[PDB]
From a paper:
The enzyme, BT3780, which lacks the canonical phosphate-binding basic residues, is up-regulated by the dominant human gut bacterium Bacteroides thetaiotaomicron in response to yeast mannan. BT3780 is encoded by a polysaccharide utilization locus (PUL) inthe B. thetaiotaomicron genome that orchestrates the depolymerization of yeast mannan. The data, presented here, showed that BT3780 and BACOVA_03624 are exo-acting glycoside hydrolases that cleave Man-β1,2-Man linkages using water, not phosphate, as the nucleophile in a single displacement reaction. Thus, the enzyme does not mediate phosphorolysis or reverse phosphorolysis reactions and therefore is not a glycoside phosphorylase. These data instead show that BT3780 is an exo-acting glycoside hydrolase that hydrolyzes β1,2-mannosidic linkages.
Residues 17–384 (the first 16 residues is a cleaved signal peptide, and residue 383 is the C-terminal Pro) were built into the 1.35 Å electron density map. The β-mannosidase displayed a five-bladed β-propeller fold. An extended pocket is located in the center of the β-propeller with all five blades contributing to the topology of the pocket. The pocket houses two mannose residues (the crystal structure of BT3780 was obtained in the presence of mannose), and its location corresponds to the active site of BF0772 and thus fulfills the same function in the B. thetaiotaomicron enzyme. The mannose residue in the +1 subsite (Man2) adopts a classic 4C1 chair conformation. In the −1 subsite (active site); however, the mannose (Man1) is in a B2,5/OS2 conformation, typical of the geometry adopted by the oxocarbenium ion transition state in β-mannanases and β-mannosidases. O1 of Man1 makes polar contacts with the side chains of Glu227, Glu268, and Tyr302; O2 interacts with Asp142 and Glu227; O3 forms a hydrogen bond with Asp142 and Asn74; O4 also makes a polar contact with Asn74, and Asp363 forms bidentate interactions with O4 and O6. At the +1 subsite, Man2 recognition is dominated by Lys199, which interacts with O2, O6, and the endocyclic oxygen; Arg89 makes three hydrogen bonds with O3 and O4, whereas Glu141 interacts with O4 and O6. BT3780 does not make interactions with O1 of Man2, and thus both the α and β anomers are evident. The carboxylates of both Glu227 and Glu268 hydrogen bond to the α-linked O1 hydroxyl of the mannoside with distances of ∼2.7 Å, and either could potentially activate a water molecule in the single-displacement mechanism.
Author numbering: 17 to 384
């Protein structure tokens, strides 16, 4: 029989620099689920497809015209396995971050355009959105053609009319990384006069990126990015998965990075290795971490959380299309003086949670 002693409890204490806890609002989640009946005339297919009928997940989030806007990854029924459908982005708006008005057709999708060899048939996956102080939204996303996933950039002033600029790493180093399999780009931002905007460091834009390791890149124009490289020209690893912890197979960038008085915070997704990971957590689960970098030297790693701050807790987080579970963190909005987090739930649903700095919740508990 348990005795309920405090010193044996499952608290998960955060360092002072870390965001959280993020509390799921009672009864709210999932906030975006598939809809069977909504059809789209696909300009590639030349017929109507049920574009959000399978799974709706891995979302971007931003602020526009006084509302939270989410662009959600939506998959059709054009194939069975993971990565075998076509991904297109849905559009939804909310004044409370919980109840959304969705558009019935997608806003971003593969088309008869400059990117068709890179985006057909897999489409456009896993967006992250940040905005300049001058009002240009910058989207990082994955192009998927069933051969190589590529990290790419699109821009817009209104979140509807998007210009595709192609792979982020197309141009640098005489095209060395054009064919690099890559994804998950977190541009550096800062809250200025209450609004989260893209932030320059040393006169250039900055992005953390990657799935298997955390890498970095700079840009002068927000579309052509130059990775940081080692002496021999290989990609320079800022940090990597580690034995014994939740972030043991992958350390995959999450939402845009945030410049704070303690340093730059990168919120990211860890995948737990069955062989090398933390056996207190489910093998192969994705659970979220945070890393701190030097404010004056953005590639200089300081520390990371030892335990995830947010992990699968509800049924639709614990299992779904991705059977081993995810809380795949990807969007954040500073809104009404709180932080609204948007995440994929097991590659199937969209969830949200709120960190209120004035009334902070606990982090998700240890299993342990
Ligand atoms: O990018 C191609 C595919 O890569 C897989 O590992 C998953 O991330 C899929 O959701 C994606 O469709
Ligand atoms: O399938 C789990 C997970 O795989 C990748 O590592 C991610 O980039 C996401 O696309 C997806 O949510």
């Amino acid at each position: 029989x348990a005795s309920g002693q405090p010193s044996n409890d499952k608290k998960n204490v955060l360092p002072d620099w870390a965001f959280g806890g993020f509390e799921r609002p009672q009864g709210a989640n999932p906030v975006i689920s598939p809809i069977e009946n909504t059809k789209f005339y696909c300009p590639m297919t030349q017929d109507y497809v049920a574009w959000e009928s399978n799974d709706t997940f891995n979302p971007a989030a931003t602020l526009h015209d006084g509302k939270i806007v989410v662009l959600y990854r939506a998959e059709d029924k054009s194939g069975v396995g993971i990565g075998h459908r076509t991904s297109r982005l849905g559009y939804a708006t909310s004044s409370d971050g919980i109840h959304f008005k969705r558009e019935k057709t997608p806003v971003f999708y593969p088309d008869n355009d400059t990117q068709k060899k890179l985006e057909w048939p897999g489409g456009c996956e896993d967006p992250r959105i940040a905005v300049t102080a001058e009002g240009l939204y910058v989207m990082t996303y994955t192009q998927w053609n069933r051969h190589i996933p590529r990290l790419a950039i699109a821009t817009s002033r209104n979140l509807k009319d998007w210009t595709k600029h192609g792979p982020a790493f197309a141009k640098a180093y005489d095209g060395k990384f054009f064919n690099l399999g890559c994804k998950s780009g977190s541009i550096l931002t800062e809250v200025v006069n209450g609004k989260q905007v893209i932030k320059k460091i040393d006169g250039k834009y900055f992005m953390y990126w990657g799935e298997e390791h955390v890498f970095a890149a700079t840009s002068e124009d927000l579309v052509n990015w130059t990775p940081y490289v080692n002496t021999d020209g290989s990609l320079r690893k800022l940090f990597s998965p580690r034995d014994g912890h939740f972030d043991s197979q992958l350390t995959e960038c999450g939402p845009p990075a945030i410049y704070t008085p303690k340093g730059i915070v990168l919120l990211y997704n860890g995948k737990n290795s069955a062989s090398r990971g933390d056996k207190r957590y489910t093998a192969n689960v994705y659970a979220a971490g945070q890393a701190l970098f030097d404010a004056n030297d953005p590639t200089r790693f300081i520390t990371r959380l030892d335990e995830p701050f947010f992990r699968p807790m509800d049924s639709f987080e614990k299992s779904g299309q991705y059977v081993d579970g995810t809380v795949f963190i990807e969007g954040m909005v500073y809104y009404k003086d709180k932080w609204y987090l948007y995440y994929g739930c097991a590659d199937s649903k969209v969830g949200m949670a709120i960190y209120n700095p004035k009334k902070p919740a606990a982090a998700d508990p240890l299993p342990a």
